[model samples]
Target: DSRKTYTLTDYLKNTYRLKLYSLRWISDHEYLYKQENNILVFNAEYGNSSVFLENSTFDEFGHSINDYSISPDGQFILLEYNYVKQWRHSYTASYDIYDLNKRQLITEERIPNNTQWVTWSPVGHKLAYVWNNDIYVKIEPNLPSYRITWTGKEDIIYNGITDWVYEEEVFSAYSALWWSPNGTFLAYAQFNDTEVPLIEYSFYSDESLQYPKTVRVPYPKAGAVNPTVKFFVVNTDSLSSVTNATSIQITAPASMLIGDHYLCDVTWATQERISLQWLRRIQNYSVMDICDYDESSGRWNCLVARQHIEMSTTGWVGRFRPSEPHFTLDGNSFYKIISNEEGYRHICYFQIDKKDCTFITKGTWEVIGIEALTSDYLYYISNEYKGMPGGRNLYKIQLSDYTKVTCLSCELNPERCQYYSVSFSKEAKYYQLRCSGPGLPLYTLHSSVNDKGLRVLEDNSALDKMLQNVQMPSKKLDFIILNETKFWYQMILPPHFDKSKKYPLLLDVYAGPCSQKADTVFRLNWATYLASTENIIVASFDGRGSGYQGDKIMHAINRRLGTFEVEDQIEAARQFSKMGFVDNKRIAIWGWSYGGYVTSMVLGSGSGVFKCGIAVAPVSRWEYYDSVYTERYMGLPTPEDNLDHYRNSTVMSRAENFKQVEYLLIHGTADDNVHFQQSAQISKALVDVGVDFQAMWYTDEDHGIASSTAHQHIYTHMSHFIKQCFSLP
Candidate 1:
């Protein structure tokens, strides 16, 4: 049933009176439901009412739910909600889990002091969450919970959830336990970060009724020491009733032998054994260690398989990427993604004994993403074709050789996009594909198993209808070689693309760690609108540090942020200028956040790569950025630090480099992350040098410029400014 009202007043009148119809659709059927009081009541013949959670304030106005998770068996619901604010800080509020079956509150937790990653266990029998830097599991019925870790405050150790560095840099929210295959022993990583130096950022709170307050965050800068992490297996039997205080051995290498190396990743190989990867302080050298724990004897033994590579050959191994090693269903051979000992990156198959490992896909091309796993084939996304940035296609090959690698998502449209984050259902007979692109909206549902044709489980008809009436522009992606390595890039033509006439080119980028610009997902509407309405070609490239291009390609720019990234983009631009459709003299570049930092670096280098550039919320100096993000790559700045490297990287100190190129700097006044002081300091430098530049200050906004109405005005003004700079008139 579809209901429409003429005005808000009429709609509210009927809605407040509970006279509106509720439509519920399930499976392949639709039913009309009713709303009574705070409950949604089904209008079936013998229907019963289920109370819906609501607030008086929400009833008076309206509210949008933020996060909600359903139990594994769908018997309980956990919801987290709060009012959306400009700066996204809600320290004090309520988070509750409700038992939908009993229509009662199971457990209610408060924010600020008691907030952490709360999640249901695999079997949904117990709830595990982080609190006070330790992991806690609450058993049901008695609601009795016990501390799994004894870490303390002064030490800055973490037991469950990730600390600041692991959360921001490693890109994982939950860091604690991995339930055992038999659901008995719990495996977790304990981090001791006392050695990691603390950098502080002060947040000022000024209100009419309260005095200003300062808040501090433990930040780690680049080249700084990361936390020393170790994995421990805690047997539930020992935790139950404390029988003799049984001991659990640490699977990591003994401190005497390994001597304080960083534990990269820990995965469960079996019920009694665990696999660990250990890397040196700089992440240059890596060695894999497998340990088997004997419960009765309380002893741990390292397996025979451990491989070592030279720090010079293998740059760095990241903790985020889970390509370490996995056992086949037979538990005989291990599947791993490894860099070539002599050349590029490839997927390798290794024996459990470490005596033999075979390289499968060993070439210069990149494997963008990995998908399903079958008895015979391993599916993934790769750029095996020549000179195609977005020329991605799904491929599958034999688990042993990859010689029969077959392209899956082939289409004649020439704008073929591939699915990511794929998961296979039980039995592996069917799968789900969530495909999206600049021309498509993100839609997810189940699909059949055939590689050629897929049946849709949930089709996005609204997006399809919207796209049908809109005239879309096509993007022609090309690959270019830079520094003897192939990279991906895409070029978007204007609405009325006249290939014979040269057009101004604007390069957009976000060349930070693990971030890529070659995704087929929906891009910024503003950038697309700028290219379609304004007669300018928009382009983007994925430089080093971006994922999917293998480990070596991504980690090459780990500690060197602005160096290799800028060189790659400049080389790509130089190649683009040779084409007839691009006007070399009118080339410009712009970015936001880290991308903004990249934009400033390219313009400041004055390599004649770009005529004008805009940087929004950029890190003028690395010393000013947040600790956890800055130190993960660059380490901490010291008195004897390389002044030339720092000076060349600092956009503010190199104002003279901007004399030939036009630079526009923009920032929000209340940016907490990359403080507005960055822009101000850059502006001060330009002013001191008598250099002319453009600056825009959003008075009351934050880093995201998230004030709804104000953001629209900002985008409109930005669109106008970009058009004027490119001389699109």
Candidate 2:
């Protein structure tokens, strides 16, 4: 029973890993981790620890330093040297500051070379950054800065950073600044992208040659011309009052300027209100607003009984946009996470002036966020437990009893725990929790007034003692009803898996939109080394545009983008090949971007139950993606909207079903999110249907070919193409 085989080089050289304790509370009674490369701290109630930064504290910065930030009165330490990256939450560094009471570094104003974004000032060590597209600030790190916005202009007037469709589809954030709550106002947002559209590509450096370098960017497809935002707040104690260095703007509701809109959230709430949200371009309406701050004409208003809105008509007010509310430290009252009269995304509560807003937590389970907010409890994270639509606990009701409710980590190790995620501490006393699984990935630390457990900050126990000798691979999660609803799936199997022989499956997709991928979390991936070395099972489902179940199977491919999550993943792989332990022609499929566009529409749905697939940086056309995520679920592909399910869903119109299976594809030539012109238009529609397959690329790798040698050369070339299509070898 206890033997070897977990290898894909023991999961791409991790060699049985999972130690991850990763802290960072930074005071509400101490925290901050990272050892060996040093940065210590601890003390969440006397667990004692010290060395807060010293692994030769930056071995005299000869080069490459990566990241560090701290300064909410820990008094300085910024660092982030040279570093590069640009998308996936944006990058571009070179900072330096330091000085935790003069332990050195600030050689005067040293935050320049490629600065592009910096922060601090949620309560001191002032800073605020963003360089070649303006914004500055720095009221101390050796003085002189203050600029604010000189009309920025570089990908055309960006200002506080975030463009490239608000950093890949509306604020997956690359700083559009914020700060406020008594840090004396500083908001931000700006982005203009003067009439968008660019996305050029190339980049091929190293092996230094005389060719490819192109690059470009802006991006906004689907119905085009997007990017125009504008928020601005600025005051940081009225920038030394040279007539308060001007910066005010807020404007948006006049029915969100009638056409194309988006800002989606900003929050801030008290020390004089501020909220925001917006959305339009038919993301089925949204609103919110709030505002306030006047101090006798320093201006900023937005009151029409505190405005709210949030429409959806059964499709898009959010699982991708709206939610963000949580307020109430005297900002009137709020709670948010909408949709209820039975479409289920609960927790409402509202009140800043109110026009109906009460729910405060309902059923058929949903919530999934709004963690921490007190004046007597509200902490969230749901999926309601045994009603587990992919379990995830941590709850807490009662702001005066909406039937009180509790269940913090659902009885803690209820059979090796369900799934969870928490992290509190900035005065909510202390939290952490974080289970993540049907096991492995534990992490503890508690105390929120009296819920106990103050210890174990990582129960991975040396990956449970090197998986106690390794024959590991077991999960199974279950569920599959279909039209009567309930689709969840999971699997992985192998390692003595033999309900009477038969195996080889694979599936593993992303089924995007709200995406769930059947959950109970534990994963040492590449489907656990293709189920402990290729006896292979490795499934995954969730079905109809997946997600924390409800919004009626998460909007079953609303506006129809690749129809019903590609026929419920080819009907959950033809009901996992009529069950008797699978092996129906040794199934297979794969995915990446939107589960590689549902594994190239379930191997181009000639679905004779897949015998080989893969996809990778997918999405082969909803007019080449992005326009706030393909017009928030395929709208405006014109013909007055959703152009016949966007010309009947293009993965190059099923290029003759790849002459029946074994496809491959891949891509990355500087992908910048699914763009190697979408696998060069599916290899020119499979060479105009003569249909031969297998592609690849990677060169300047992007859309997460994610370096480290292109993620170990795309998982050892998809583990030798799933062991040559399961015929093993």
Candidate 3:
């Protein structure tokens, strides 16, 4: 049999998905994995396994079991069922606790229906969960619950749970709570949205309800009234008194409270010392305060001399807000990544009571994140391998001497592994390196003491065999220059590609600020199908606002988002056409969300480069986006700050220019991120300009269009539109 092309049906059914080893490290020597529906605990060093829970343990459930989580102590498991998603990261679920030693489910004092969030203490079996926006704590799973707050009013006050804005932008998690490392205290943030406005959308469930339900969420758009937040810490050990438990309040720094600010990060340096970062609304300045608790007076004090200031005279502070500190064991010193004198991200070592920090690592390349820190070694992932911004490698820097740096993954099968991420055990004795790159994903276990590989966890052998009989596309990772600077680009060339023969080109774009679409990671998705089945070359470019390279490239489009980024994409497509293998007349472009905004901008450029393009859930105007994200890059939409660029950068401003190209607009009516109203406005602008185009709106889908049937429908429709524009039969 000859090689077969990858079909859309195969993509829709996920027939060739990569088989992965999905496991969670329980301890230094043990990890858990689900095998044939049963939970198995594997010994990392010995390669032995034990059944943690039988598959038939939950066979008698009335409702379908959605997911499960094991407690830190391995004494109990939280069984999550009846899952209902609310927003991008927020969800409500019903939970039941299973006792591992007793081999039975706890029946008394069970978690209520529709719990907002739940978590076990860091080291014990103590349980804490949020219901109806109020937080509750229990010393044991089956014990009586202790109410922590009584002022929880739905949509007005949120305790231990994030509001819509914080959930989507800042923490990116539903729970706004953090537990101490020793489980001695619980620190949580409370958000008050009483003054914020709401975003309302219509939800059409089924035909059973004739009228549509109007759903409202508290959302603070740009230049709008933002929510007020408060921080609290409660002692779990002292929950009993003559009265209810006392939640001590921790206020922000004086400079932060004077203006609109945000609690960006919270780190528990030790049981008695806590570090918190505060950022002003402008986001160019940040302050880190290290607070110490005195047990005799039960009071917290932040030493004035210990305050650390990070500001940018050139641009916004550390990417997003500021880099979180990785503390040493005794909480005396820490390490963080910050821009050096040359604007390259490097690791800096700082003392807790000092204002200045010394750089331990420096170069043109940037350290991605600090993975683990020990008394003798600090492990991190950097893009310094061959100075390539798109590749990742793990490195260990000796604490005694920075000159004694060693590359932990540089020589580990470099041909197949270019991008690597590692997970260390609790005590930093063992590690798991995940090599996901130019080849299939390879997972392996290693010992930190000897730097020896224990065994291979997964090699994706099953996927490699299945793909052998398919005509898969080959990816070319290279650089393209526009103004002397190198802008990395990736092209998924069709199988059996020829330089003399022309092929249709597709520019898959996402040029948002700090966005990198071109990387050395293996993926099987729409682009794979296009190149294999339709002989289309799918290309992605990391242009003006892309990340991982440096600040100069990433911050180019900071205040003017829809300007240079969109033009760079148009130029990118133009450059691709000049290549010998690409067909100029059959070029297409498409994107979603911020990517969607750039796609619409490029299609409306009147450059005559693209024949057709699609925009799904695109942001037509920055004014409609939330304040934290939009204002971080665009400043404010006020008359004094950045109003000029705000008015000039909207996609709606170029409506008349869109008449020269074929356009297809898609959106979900219930999208909460980039609201459906963004695409709705785009349609209205096009309609008013007397332009002919195509449009589709999913009735009840959200931003992702991710439901089972809806996901297939949207992709199939887009495939048809793309092939029709290319004149493919």
* Best model per TM-score: 3
**Model 2 spans with C-alpha error above 4 angstroms:** 1-155, 169-171, 185-217, 220-234, 239-411, 414-419, 430-436, 439-498, 509-519, 522-584, 594-680, 683-685, 692-729
Kindly indicate the candidate among 1 and 3 with the higher TM-score: 3
lDDT per residue as tens, model 2, 1-729: 548978888777788877767788877888888878888998898888998878686798776678799998887889887788788878888888888877888887678889889998887788889899888888788887778788888888888888877777777888889988867888998888878888898797987677767989888888889888989797788687264368889888888788878987798888778999988888988887998878899889898678887787878888988878888888798888887878888888889876888887887888888888888998888888889888888888878987988888898898887987888888878898878788888888988889788898888887798797888889989898877877879898988888878888888888888878788888787788788877788888888777788887778678887888888788888888888888898889888887888788888878688888888888888888877888787778878776888888888888897788888888788887778887898889889878878777888888788688889899899889889889787
Q: Write the per-residue lDDT of candidate 3 for residues 53-116, one digit (tens) a residue.
A: 8888888866677888898988899999989999987999999998998988999999899999
Best prediction by lDDT: 3
Instruction: State model 2's lDDT.
Output: 0.83
Of the pair 1 and 3, which is ahead by lDDT? 3
Per-residue lDDT of 493-610 in model 1, one digit per residue for the tens? 7665888899889898888876678655544355556665565788888888776666667777765678888888887788888977899879999889898888988888879879
Give the better candidate number (1 or 2) by lDDT.
2
Model 3 residue 611 CA deviation in Å: 1.3
Q: Sort the candidates on TM-score, descending order.
A: 3, 1, 2
> For each candidate, what TM-score against the reference?
0.78, 0.32, 0.98
Q: In model 3, which runs have C-alpha deviations exceeding 4 angstroms?
A: none
**Model 2: pairs clashing at backbone N, Cα or C within 3 Å:** 153-157, 264-277, 592-596
